[PDB]
UniProtKB/TrEMBL annotation, chain D:
Keyword annotations: Activator, cAMP, cAMP-binding, DNA-binding, Nucleotide-binding, Repressor, Transcription, Transcription regulation
Lineage: Bacteria, Bacillati, Actinomycetota, Actinomycetes, Kitasatosporales
Parts forming coiled coils: none
Ranges where the Cyclic nucleotide-binding domain occurs: 10-130
BP terms from Gene Ontology: negative regulation of DNA-templated transcription; positive regulation of DNA-templated transcription
UniProt-recorded name of the protein: CRP-like cAMP-activated global transcriptional regulator
Molecular function GO labels: cAMP binding; DNA binding; DNA-binding transcription factor activity
GO cellular component, one term: cytosol
């Protein structure tokens, strides 16, 4: 429910979302705690359940580049679930936070049983890709 | 190894192993067009990906003025309607055979049986799509400034 | 160094061009909580923040404000509205007391009429943004 | 629009006298079928408007794959942003027919703006709109 309040999982039914929740782990942050640092290995997504999380980078002059504030029911590290890679930002608790995490290693076991879910996940991610490279302009003019 | 190389010269199936490529190939259907045949019409329901194996397909779209604007010319080893395999929806272009064309097609409907036979494929397909969506959004403009 | 030249748009201006741009601008002071502009307001003005911080936010489909950026000293707001006026797509709010320098689209032609090297510099800067875009970036 | 110059978003704002001047200040270029206008990677500093004939733009892929990109006909622009920000040609241009073009180079820009100072804001609007609608399309940030 908190879990289906995002486009990735918004297509799941009660049974499927109940199973997803049981595949996930509970994560707690105190205010000011770091969830991860830019460049850390990332192989998991989070759904925020309560509190707020800040994502930033830092410019070569030393100034914070503030990228987002992620609140209840929003995703962190969505694409890490499918394609693990270095974190592109540092995540920092602004408040007492609760999240649910799903790791890349938990993906295959969840999907082995449920190929109905794999297709729903593929539809979700492909919907997003569709709009991106469509928007991603022309210059087919040899500028 | 070189068996299904034609199916791997693209950002979707590039990482498939030889066995997965064999399953992909067995799952596909052969299509052959004569010159001037239309593969599909813009606006048609679309739920298939194609890999052209010979000939050329011109993709085109109807102009605000009634003419067809050229969009692409697709030849051997290139894909048509890639994301429609995962997210069926109306065709945004007409594909017209410029020559004798042969293609291999995979439909949305063929995906589930393949994933059921080979569950690792779901993870591999999710990886491939996530990778590109990543490059588009991340490796790539800003102006979060209001204007 | 120069608060106006720490952005890709005006970076290539020399000392005297920056000074004359600055003399052509309007200073704006905001108290904490003041709104610089509302989403949907006519937008025809670029700002450079010179002190404090401005939060840019957009109304989310669920009705919460969604933060797009926080803009600090040396950073731009409304850059493209200087050249191509149109509705503001975000609300800007002062998180602190804020001072800015503003240049409006109405000021642009008076400034450029006698400064063709500046105009060419600005065109290069905008175009380069397009070039690097596509240097980083269908099926039917 | 009958004007071979004002059928594109870049120059579409201009009035009759400023287009005629612009035209007479551009250089005429002639290509025979099979001529190369430019090679992908070549330094570029000018835009062209095709006045007659057709130019194929194609770029080259991993295996050495000549990859078709556009066919540019009369009243259409080639290398638009090369005028403002000279850099490497993103494609090869090959004449499909005998072709005629008008060329405007980066070096012709400052003298033009000296004679016609108000043109600067019209070009800025046009390039900024290209950039804005992109940004408007985009702005589709979670640590990845």
């Amino acid at each position: 429910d908190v879990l289906r309040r995002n486009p990735l999982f918004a297509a799941l039914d009660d049974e499927q979302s109940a199973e997803l929740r049981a595949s996930m782990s509970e994560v707690t942050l105190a205010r000011g705690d770091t969830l991860f640092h830019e460049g850390d290995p990332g192989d998991r997504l989070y759904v925020v359940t309560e509190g707020k999380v800040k994502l930033h980078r830092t410019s070569p002059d030393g100034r914070e580049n503030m990228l987002a504030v992620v609140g209840p029911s929003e995703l962190i590290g969505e694409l890490s679930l499918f394609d693990p890679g270095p974190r592109t930002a540092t995540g920092t608790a602004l408040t007492e936070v609760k999240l649910l995490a799903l790791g890349h290693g938990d993906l295959q076991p969840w999907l082995n049983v449920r190929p109905e879910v794999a297709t729903a996940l593929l539809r979700a991610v492909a919907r997003r890709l569709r709009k991106t490279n469509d928007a991603m302009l022309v210059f087919s003019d040899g500028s």
